[PDB]
Design a protein around this ligand. Structure first.
Ligand SMILES: Cc1cc2nc3c(=O)[nH]c(=O)nc-3n(C[C@H](O)[C@H](O)[C@H](O)COP(=O)(O)OP(=O)(O)OC[C@H]3O[C@@H](n4cnc5c(N)ncnc54)[C@H](O)[C@@H]3O)c2cc1C
Length: 450
């Protein structure tokens, strides 16, 4: 059984390992050069939040130990707001609930080694150009433009949010594609080990600078450098045309004044802010949903290729790793590749839609809009119910971040919990008019333990 994978990123390299371990002949093609070839280059790859979902997918592949050896433990959040230095807000309810920060290039190199150790052949410096589904052949382009034609039996599209495989599929089947762009862009910035230490930025934490309609978030690296992401409107809306947006930050000097005003404890650590701002492009935020992820038994999409999402729950990589495991499982036990791909799509598509929406709801949190009094009372009640019934009432964030519950079931339980809270608080001022024992009974009736 032979398979061709396009894209030696996170999902593609993991599924290569799993399939090769299961006895598949795996050929993996990647447009970029092999990052394991030693150069003088200082890598500027971002650090990623690896949660229990991703960690478990790596465990199944036998790689968790190697990845975590090169990852920084984030025990909690540091929320930077004016008035006092931040204190750690620890994760969940014990020490075992942490998030790991792993550098993208480090993870990629570990996955590549893992894929080759399992028997996969990885071919770099070759970009997928086109696919011929009738004759079962695809075309790759090399660095100078030479076009190489190859046979495939099964094509896995793991080539990212602008997947060339997906583009090829659209020419033979209606993907039912819907694109939802968001008004925020992002810019990746860097903190050196020296800057971070000078201003005492805690390495073992996730750092956030909230500011209503815009914000920054930073994740640590092994060498004490941090990667910072600014999220900010591309343009100022028609109302509030003076509100901050990238269009006002016409150059690095404007960027610097923006940070000095809005993020004063962060600006001094951004040594290369001006250059980073001008040299790096402003990224776009979008969600892309497809009704179908496969063409018969010939081709399938996974990871960012199948379901681009906004980066606001730190789950795109975690979802991509989950995808790789599921795809390998379905391909190993299916009647033909066509059955495997349909079964895989039916399992993972509802979960992808769920995290895409929950990421957007996490993204919608980033707003200057105040919390309703109703909302605050619901939150207080939910914290009490979480204490009294910790196996039934679990905040949706913890279900997503610290468990392996399928995304769609996390969203379903969150819906039940929110309905329960909405009716318990409906026409009550404060908490003292709410019968907490009666509410706890409703929690027991409506939410089975996990
Ligand atoms: C700012 C930001 C922060 C994020 N933070 C997090 C986080 O904290 N946690 C998290 O879980 N996720 C995070 N994500 C999401 C995460 O980066 C992605 O979901 C993840 O990288 C997708 O993995 P993938 O393997 O599907 O795609 P990729 O990692 O993008 O891999 C695609 C690969 O295919 C290759 N390729 C592309 N086109 C071709 C072609 N034509 N031919 C051959 N090869 C090709 C590319 O070179 C690349 O190697 C973040 C995203 C952004 C933008």
């Amino acid at each position: 059984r032979q398979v061709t994978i396009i894209g030696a990123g996170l999902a593609g390299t993991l599924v290569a390992r799993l399939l090769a371990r299961n006895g598949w002949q795996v050929n993996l093609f990647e447009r970029r050069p092999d990052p394991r070839i030693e150069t003088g280059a200082r890598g500027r790859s971002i650090n990623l939040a690896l949660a229990e979902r991703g960690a478990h997918a790596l465990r199944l592949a036998g790689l968790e130990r190697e990845v975590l050896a090169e990852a920084v433990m984030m025990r909690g959040r540091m929320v930077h707001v004016p008035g006092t230095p931040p204190n750690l807000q620890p994760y969940g309810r014990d020490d075992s609930e942490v998030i790991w920060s792993i550098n993208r290039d480090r993870l990629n190199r570990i996955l590549l080694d893992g894929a080759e150790a399992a028997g996969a052949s990885i071919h770099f410096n070759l970009g997928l150009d086109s696919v011929d589904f009738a004759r079962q052949r695809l075309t790759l382009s090399n660095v100078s433009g030479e076009r190489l034609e190859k046979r495939f039996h099964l094509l896995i599209g793991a080539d990212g949010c602008n997947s060339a495989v997906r583009q090829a599929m659209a020419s033979v089947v209606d993907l039912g594609e819907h694109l939802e762009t968001q008004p925020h862009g992002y810019k990746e910035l860097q903190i050196t080990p020296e800057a971070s230490a000078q201003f005492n930025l805690e390495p073992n934490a996730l750092h956030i600078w909230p500011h209503g309609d815009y914000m920054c978030i930073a994740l640590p690296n092994l060498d004490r450098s941090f990667t910072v992401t600014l999220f900010l409107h591309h343009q100022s809306p028609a109302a509030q045309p003076a509100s901050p947006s990238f269009a006002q930050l016409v150059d690095g000097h404007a960027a610097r004044r923006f940070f000095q005003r809005q993020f004063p404890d962060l600006s001094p650590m951004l040594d290369s802010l001006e250059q980073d701002f001008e040299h790096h492009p402003t990224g776009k935020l979008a969600t892309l949903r497809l009704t179908t992820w496969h063409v018969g038994g010939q081709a399938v999409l996974l990871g960012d290729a199948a379901h681009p999402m906004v980066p606001f729950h730190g789950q795109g990589m975690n979802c991509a790793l989950e995808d790789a495991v599921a795809l390998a499982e379905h391909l190993q036990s299916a009647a033909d590749n066509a059955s495997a791909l349909a079964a895989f799509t039916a399992q993972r598509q509802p979960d992808a839609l769920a995290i895409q929406a929950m990421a957007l709801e996490n993204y919608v949190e980033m707003s200057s809009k105040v919390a309703s009094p109703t909302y605050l009372l619901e939150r207080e009640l939910g914290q009490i119910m979480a204490q009294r019934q910790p196996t039934r009432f679990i905040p949706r964030y913890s279900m997503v971040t610290f468990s392996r519950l399928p995304y769609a079931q996390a969203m379903a339980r969150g819906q039940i919990q929110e309905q329960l809270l909405k009716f318990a608080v409906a026409n009550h001022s404060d908490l003292t008019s709410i019968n907490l024992d009666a509410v706890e009974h409703e929690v027991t009736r409506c939410l089975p333990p996990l």
